[PDB]
Design a protein around this ligand. Sequence first.
Ligand SMILES: [Ca+2]
Ligand SMILES: [Ca+2]
Ligand SMILES: [Ca+2]
Ligand SMILES: [Ca+2]
Ligand SMILES: [Ca+2]
Ligand SMILES: [Ca+2]
Lengths: 67, 54, 4, 4, 4, 4, 292, 285, 303, 296
Amino acid sequence: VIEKVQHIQLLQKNVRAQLVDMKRLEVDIDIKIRSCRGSCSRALAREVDLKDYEDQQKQLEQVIAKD
Amino acid sequence: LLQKNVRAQLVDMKRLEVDIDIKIRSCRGSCSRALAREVDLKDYEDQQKQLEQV
Amino acid sequence: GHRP
Amino acid sequence: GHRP
Amino acid sequence: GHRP
Amino acid sequence: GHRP
Amino acid sequence: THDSSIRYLQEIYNSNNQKIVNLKEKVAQLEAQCQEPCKDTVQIHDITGKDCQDIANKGAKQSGLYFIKPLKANQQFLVYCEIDGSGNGWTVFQKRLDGSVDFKKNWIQYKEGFGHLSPTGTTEFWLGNEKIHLISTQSAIPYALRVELEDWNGRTSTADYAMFKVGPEADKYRLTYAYFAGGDAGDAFDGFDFGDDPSDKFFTSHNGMQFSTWDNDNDKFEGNCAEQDGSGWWMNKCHAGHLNGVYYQGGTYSKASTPNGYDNGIIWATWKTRWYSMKKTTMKIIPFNRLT
Amino acid sequence: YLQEIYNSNNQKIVNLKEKVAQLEAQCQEPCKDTVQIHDITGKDCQDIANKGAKQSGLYFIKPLKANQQFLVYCEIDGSGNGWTVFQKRLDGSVDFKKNWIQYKEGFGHLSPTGTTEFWLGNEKIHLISTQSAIPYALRVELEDWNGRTSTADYAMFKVGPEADKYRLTYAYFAGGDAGDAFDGFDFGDDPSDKFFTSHNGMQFSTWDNDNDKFEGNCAEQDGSGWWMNKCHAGHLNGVYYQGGTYSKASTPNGYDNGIIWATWKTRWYSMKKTTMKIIPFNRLT
Amino acid sequence: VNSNIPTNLRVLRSILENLRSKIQKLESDVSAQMEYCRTPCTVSCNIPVVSGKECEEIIRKGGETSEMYLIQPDSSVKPYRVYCDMNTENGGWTVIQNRQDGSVDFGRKWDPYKQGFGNVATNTDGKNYCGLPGEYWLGNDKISQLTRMGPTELLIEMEDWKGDKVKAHYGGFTVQNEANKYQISVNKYRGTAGNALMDGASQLMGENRTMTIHNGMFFSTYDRDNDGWLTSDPRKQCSKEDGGGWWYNRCHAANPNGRYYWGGQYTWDMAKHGTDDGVVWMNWKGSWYSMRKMSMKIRPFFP
Amino acid sequence: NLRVLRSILENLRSKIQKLESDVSAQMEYCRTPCTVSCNIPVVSGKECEEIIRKGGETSEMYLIQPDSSVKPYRVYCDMNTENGGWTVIQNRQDGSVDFGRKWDPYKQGFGNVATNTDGKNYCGLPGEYWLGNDKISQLTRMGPTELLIEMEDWKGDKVKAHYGGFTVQNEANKYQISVNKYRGTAGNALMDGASQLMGENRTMTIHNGMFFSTYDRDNDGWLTSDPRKQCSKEDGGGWWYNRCHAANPNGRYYWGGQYTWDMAKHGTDDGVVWMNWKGSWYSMRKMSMKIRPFFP
Ligand SMILES: [Ca+2]
Ligand SMILES: [Ca+2]
Ligand SMILES: [Ca+2]
Ligand SMILES: [Ca+2]
Ligand SMILES: [Ca+2]
Ligand SMILES: [Ca+2]
């Protein structure tokens, strides 16, 4: 009857992965956008809130301890 | 007399040589060249003085 | 860097 | 210009 | 000359 | 000519 | 229980996950759009020649930057050619517009040239003396020097000089020209009767004068005309025509403004008072015949 | 006899006076002068040829600018070109060491045979060359002491007014086997050489009127009247040296002052004959 | 008893809510940039009168200001634009590579690196001349041909985000032609950074260090494997993982043509492939620090 | 006895031969004419003074154009005598030209202006001539003009007569002459008449104010009716004769100078005479008239 144990211990492992693919993506983008300043009429100004990421990824490991 | 007619002859003569002497010289400035000549008017004088005595 |  |  |  |  | 939740999460997981693959595709498309550098408005035409005129003969129909290589030159170099509708190719070697460039340069800089070349002809410069030399003397064909002047009231004038030639460095790039071909600006290159002393006009004529810089005094003055007026020009106990002079805004100026107390602005005594500096200036040449 | 011989010569006289008269008639006309001036006039020699002149000789002209006619020598070829000669050298007959005035009004003699030396006045040369918008060409004919000849043409040849000291101007060297001496000559050594021996745009100078670009007096030093510039490379009104060749020893001030044309011969070689003449550009080609 | 607090595990929902919003933000930013890219950036670099074989010649000919000049190293070749540094160490430098604001993508293919890419220079505040250098890479053919005219020295400057700066000077620098895969050769080092090019990373030891020496390496782009990493796995190559083109060995100790990480300090979870792909110079600040400014200049040696 | 006259006529008979021969000889010489080649000097002017001002330093034949209306003509300039700048109007020096001429020739001018030198290509030697009366007149009317008359006897001595005022009228006014302001070593024959004569006898030899008269145009101060009795036909050539003369520059060139009434074609002193100096029976060897301008 414990369908919600291995169903979660995986889901959580899957979001951890999601974050990485995500973090790297924001960076890749942050970089690719800046690389257009030297090509297009102008480049969108933007700061990467990687802290929002750090704090959100720290709140996740806080969970990993149960099973 | 007739000695009177030659006296006249001499004059018409003297003046003529002169006229000629002059007319000839006036050709130097016109013709290829002009004959050179001196007037022996003394020949005239001596000849007219020898007449005077008569 | 390097690659083992 | 001119120089004295 | 002149005329006598 | 010239004048040096 | 509350299993309904997990359903949503698992769902949302693939939600954004499916969004990613397509996003990585957008990036690729973006990456493709950011490869070419910024477009430079300045462009150099394909035609070449002995001089600007030669180029116009080859069908050039626009005033701009072109490379040339006089019969004497063993290396081509860029120049600005002014081409009119009639079909005349002027080779500009000097130009003034604003106080952007400091013409107080040394011998070397005046030899090799300084300033910038623009296709729009909206920039100040001094083609090198050496280049001016190679061009003007490259062939037997006589050149004519035209001097275009513009005051601060929009009015303009000119001055042509037949058989304009600049000597070799060995002769300190002496300025020569047969005669003043005419113009409403007047013949300043012939000197000016500034009054007083009779030697004035003689001592302010430029024909047959060697070039002088602060570091290379070749004037007919016991002092240094170039250092004193801060320029590079064909000085002779100074000048009456001084196009590489100090740029004074407004035109008019007094000896007070001047450093050494002498007129050192861009002057042309036959057209304006020495205390009046021009707004724009242009020294250019073209083969004589184009005027006959 | 008596009255015979008297009337003999006396009858001879009257007839003689008749011969005289006839003689007198033969001696009234003056000597025939071989020199004659043709009836045709014009703006210049070319203009005259246009009017049908078919022989090189003396003619009167009056440029549009002139307010008084003057005599000139016109060289007319078979093609139909009327050259107006303003300078000519043949032997050492005329002394070209003349002053300003003489060079202005001209000196020498004009001959129908063109066998005489002269310098038409500068003022005349001026009035002609500038009389109209039509450009003139100056041809310079040179002949050495070996019969060889050459020429040199200069387009848009013009001589300025006295106010500008009759400055020599010309657009360009129209060509010729004699070489362009009016452009100066590279006499070696010093680089300024060619520059300081060119004649284009030079003012005329005489001993009594120094207008050269030399601290000294080129004209007084070379004994001539020419368009000097720290002297010369072309010097047609120079000292006539017999034989052509000469050394600085021969020269007074120690400089070349003969009739020279550096592009054709060494400065130590003086020409035998010389001719400066003009004609409207159009005739050329 | 059994399920203690599974509901207080919504410290996972608070996460996804943010991610769902993040995507929005991102997708928006891109489309925005997509638009800005309808129209291109422009410059108007009026050409200085003076030219020469290269910058040194130019400064000798009186070119005192650092700006864009037209140089023609050989009459065979066509004159090209280049940025000259006439202020640093006696001036006369020809800029080969320049990084300073991340405005140009250095992650490129073989040809672009061969032909050259980026912006040589840009206009100043209110001036009619391009006196400011741009991020660029002079073509490999150009670079090569230059180092082969005669002896050539190399100057490499870098600056961290804190303002500090160091350099590396190699008195000998030579790049071969395309046929020789642009093999690099340097020597006679001296400087304040480390001799990364000749000695490899100082942090590593043994064969681990030696495999990061760039000296003698071949140039390799992500579409042309020429690194000292003999393997078979296609995805496992030096270039495709570490940014742009460079003379990679069993990868690197110095990566000037890396990826411009803003801020400098970066981590593996940021790197596209989990490798130090930034504008790195290990010998000075490790591999997880991307310089703010990095440049490569060349000038003829003693003769 | 005194029939020695034979000796006379014998000579006369021979004289005629001689003469008739000389003439026919000259007749021959006249088949062919004399020739000159006077190459024209580059410089010209209104007259000789202008020419010398323009740099004409040598005395020779020049072309002068006094008025653009008229055609330039040849004339001999004297650039050595008294500061030079003289235009020779009349010249006598060797009897090579006949001055006994008619009205027109004297009006048009006659003789030889100049001749070639020893071995030169220019005519630097003046010839005997008379510049036309029209030419002379027109010249004296341009402005104030002075006159210089020089003469030389056969012994080598020479004197002059200078009139600071000289004017000749036009054909209509019969070329009336007017002179004044004399100074010189000869006599003022033109204004005062012969010094040897007295009373009305003298006054009738004044030339000042007279009209020009040739042998075919009587305009002398000899009011009479006898045709053969006129001043010109008896005294040589054309001149401003009054009741004849005190000066006769265009007379007849008597060789030797000293001559007599029995030599003169009409028994009158018709030689190149200037009474005031050497009487009326002496014909000068050289005689000339040169003119020049002024200022007022
Ligand atoms: Ca003055
Ligand atoms: Ca000095
Ligand atoms: Ca002088
Ligand atoms: Ca590999
Ligand atoms: Ca008669
Ligand atoms: Ca009467």
